[PDB]
Design a protein around this ligand. Structure first.
Ligand code: HEC
Length: 104
């Protein structure tokens, strides 16, 4: 995916509720540093719904592709109130940005 395009999506659509840097603040949603390769619901210091705590999957390209298409369908009960991203390419780009920015 295209990291530049993903950055723009993140800033426009996600930053309202999320940070990505190491040690960054929780907002409505959790800080996302360290996301890849970790189970759902594991950002230190954030109180998740039971649903996000218990989904029991590992975040990686394939699972983020599905989640970001329709968050509520993937994690019923989630408190992330955000419209799914329909376009596959946009999800790919966003995920490439996340994979970089959440792993500095
Ligand atoms: C506020 C209105 C949000 C917007 C906009 C986005 N997200 Fe979000 N996210 C939000 C909350 C409140 C939560 C926790 C939900 C819960 O039920 O406890 C989340 C969670 C995520 C996760 C899961 C994190 C985990 O550690 O399992 C991811 C991967 C995530 N959010 C990503 C994300 C992206 C990339 C967004 C823009 C497309 C985005 N979120 C928007 C709140 C909000």
């Amino acid at each position: 995916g295209d990291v530049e395009k993903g950055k723009k999506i993140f800033v426009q659509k996600c930053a309202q509720c999320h940070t990505v840097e190491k040690g960054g603040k929780h907002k409505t949603g959790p800080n996302l540093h360290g996301l890849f390769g970790r189970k759902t619901g594991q950002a230190p210091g954030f109180t998740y719904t039971d649903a996000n705590k218990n989904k029991g999957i590992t975040w990686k390209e394939e699972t983020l592709m599905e989640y970001l298409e329709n968050p509520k369908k993937y994690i019923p009960g989630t408190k992330m109130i955000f419209a799914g991203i329909k376009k596959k390419t946009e999800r790919e780009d966003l995920i490439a940005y996340l994979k970089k920015a959440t792993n500095e």
